């Protein structure tokens, strides 16, 4: 009657970017056993992360509230001949979510940022629906999922006025807050140095792009940001 505990390394995170990580539930559970994740002290798990049972895999989109330390745990039950989930075991790790930071362009070097403003508000989504927004961007973007920010609209700015190139969309009116999706071309880039965004500009006026992404689309543009 050994019991054995399992240690998880503590993970970390950033706002606007995409988090998935592998939990090793084969050594905290045996054949027979139920396994439970979720906030440490709690029947759910935070408002950003998400548990997929079969694939072991817990992932999540942080919004700039979900900022701090999350402290998660897995536990491993059995069930009694009456149905009852008997304590087990449980392993305890935390996630550090970092604020909007990103973990190149030559410091002084501004990034040529791609931007996708949508008719929709994050904190209405679940992290789910989050992480299926941006894996279903790939196909314009181009950009692996980890890759790309997502972030809600602040002061109702559905707009940037330093954007060289910007294009419309879908959307007549827009609903929600709104929320934006971009991600990077390059440094320091300007009309000419940009690659081919016709995949990106077509697909969004035409709706094409909405039609796939499941928002409607207020409009793109490209930006050089100062870093950070």
Same mark, same amino acid.
């Given at each position: 009657a050994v019991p054995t505990v399992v240690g998880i390394p503590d993970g970390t995170a950033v706002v606007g970017r995409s988090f998935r990580v592998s939990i090793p539930t084969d /050594?905290?559970?045996?054949? +027979?056993?139920?396994?439970? *994740?979720?906030?440490? +002290?709690?029947?759910? /798990?935070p408002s950003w992360l998400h548990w997929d049972p079969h694939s072991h895999i817990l992932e999540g989109l942080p919004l700039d509230?979900?900022?701090? *330390?999350?402290?998660? #745990? *897995? #536990?491993?039950? !059995?069930?009694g001949a009456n149905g009852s989930h008997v304590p087990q075991t449980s392993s305890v790790f935390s996630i550090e979510v970092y604020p909007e930071d990103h973990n190149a362009c030559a410091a002084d070097e501004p990034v040529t940022v791609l931007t996708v403003i949508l008719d929709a508000d994050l904190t209405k989504m679940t992290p789910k629906q989050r992480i299926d927004l941006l894996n279903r961007m790939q196909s314009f973007s181009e950009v692996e999922l980890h890759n790309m920010k997502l972030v809600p609209v602040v002061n109702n700015r559905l707009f940037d006025m330093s954007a060289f190139m910007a294009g419309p969309g879908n959307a007549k009116k827009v609903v929600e807050n709104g929320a934006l999706l971009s991600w990077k071309l390059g440094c320091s880039l300007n009309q000419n140095s940009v690659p081919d965004? !016709? +995949?990106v500009e077509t697909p969004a006026r035409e709706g094409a792009m909405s039609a796939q992404l499941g928002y409607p689309v207020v409009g793109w543009h490209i930006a050089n940001k100062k870093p950070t």
């Open positions: /050594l905290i559970a045996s054949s +027979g056993e139920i396994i439970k *994740v979720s906030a440490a +002290g709690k029947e759910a /798990l509230t979900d900022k701090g *330390v999350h402290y998660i #745990s *897995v #536990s491993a039950a !059995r069930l965004i !016709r +995949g």
